[PDB]
Amino acid sequence: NNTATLCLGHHAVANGTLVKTMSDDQIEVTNATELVQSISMGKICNKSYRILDGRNCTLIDAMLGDPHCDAFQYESWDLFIERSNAFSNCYPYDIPDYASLRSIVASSGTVEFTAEGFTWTGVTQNGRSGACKRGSADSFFSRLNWLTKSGSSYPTLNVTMPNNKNFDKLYIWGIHHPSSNQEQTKLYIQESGRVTVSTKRSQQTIIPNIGSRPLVRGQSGRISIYWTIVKPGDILMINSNGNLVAPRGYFKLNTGKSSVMRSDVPIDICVSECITPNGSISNDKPFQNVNKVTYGKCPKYIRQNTLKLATGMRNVPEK
């Protein structure tokens, strides 16, 4: 005609997708994005964090110095992976407050050891055991020194070691529980032993406990493991008349981004910034449904496996 008509509109697409609003359970829009990461990578990426595969070793074992853990001797990590085939292979023990020690060491992020010159006067050092074979010879945890009677004497040990460095030292020590009074007196003159590890500000006395326990690698005796933090300027002191499993030096204690994770998933050559037991996961979404156990730069864990965020107007197809 000799007059015009002008119409306004908006676009639509062929492949619309449903989202949820305050007003509707499901409503179609032109485009939506997933906000929840639910696919893992199936493997832990060796980059960008420093990953140490524990293999057959637990973290506690690698630091104590179980013979099959000797390879970890010099190691530090961002994240230490604890596998499930993981087992122990040295003298049987137990750590009262195990998890705490596990946590302290994990966040320290190293099993690196600095030997110190302790003097144990009039006692035989380096007690070894058939339960703890290095190669195929009797041995013991490498970071512990098993002291017994020399000749016919075990005199009151009274050894001292001041902290002159400007950091906290972590000392790991222990006590040995023999299986019979017969064994006790044999290895440690006195009928009843004890250990009093002390500083200027704390102290801990541990008494051994005679008796048979179930056989573990041929042995019915046991060892209990304890720790002590010595502050700069402070001073360590070990007093014992029997049963002491002595430290060989200290662990440097670090404040750091370090940790430990239980995982059976393999380690592979890729890059990523977030790790779960299920593997490394992608970083870009705000939420995540893979695992509540996470390390690194991770999206927040939530219960839902899917959440759609509208990134376009409402989709109204021809009709």
Binding site: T3, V13, M22, K292, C298, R303, L307, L309, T311
Partner: protein
């Protein structure tokens, strides 16, 4: 939509617009044509882009924490560790659900707004020279070629130029 434009007075979307989010179709003396309106398209897109980054902090490094899986039955402390985590998860789960609903609602509404905003802009330009057809269409009461249409799109349209002519075509009527 709160404005009744999208999925309301505008019957439906144009799949033929591979060009922009909002625009015009017109029939005139030179034939029929179609043009996307960039400012509208841009205003919407700008609001929708980086939407979530205005609420959620750029994701943060987190290292050693608490344990969340257990082999041994321990009681009191493990009870607390499990509850702390359970509480944390449930609270974030709420946050995420509510956030999505809020954002989507906002998105829907701002896009309906931009459509309406543009229709209104055009209606205001035309004055009594035109007629609101009701389906987001204007009956224009005068000869309007492509340069004429193009001027309405640029916002340079002058109705005082066409007033006299429009009136004639409009007020031809009465019985």
């Amino acid at each position: 939509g709160i404005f009744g434009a999208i999925a309301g007075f505008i019957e439906n979307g144009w799949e033929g617009m591979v060009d922009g989010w909002y625009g015009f179709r017109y029939q005139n003396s030179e034939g029929t044509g179609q043009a996307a309106d960039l400012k509208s398209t841009q205003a919407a897109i700008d609001q929708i882009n980086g939407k979530l980054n205005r609420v959620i902090e750029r994701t943060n490094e987190k290292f050693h924490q608490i344990e969340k899986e257990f082999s041994e039955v321990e009681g009191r402390i493990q009870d607390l560790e499990k509850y702390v985590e359970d509480t944390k998860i449930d609270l974030w789960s709420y946050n995420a659900e509510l956030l999505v609903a809020l954002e989507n609602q906002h998105t829907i509404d701002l896009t309906d707004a931009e459509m309406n905003k543009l229709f209104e802009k055009t209606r205001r330009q035309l004055r009594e020279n035109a007629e609101d057809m009701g389906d987001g269409c204007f009956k224009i009461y005068h000869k309007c070629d492509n340069a004429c249409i193009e001027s309405i799109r640029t916002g340079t349209y002058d109705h005082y130029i066409y007033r006299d002519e429009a009136l004639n075509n409009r007020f031809q009527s009465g019985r």
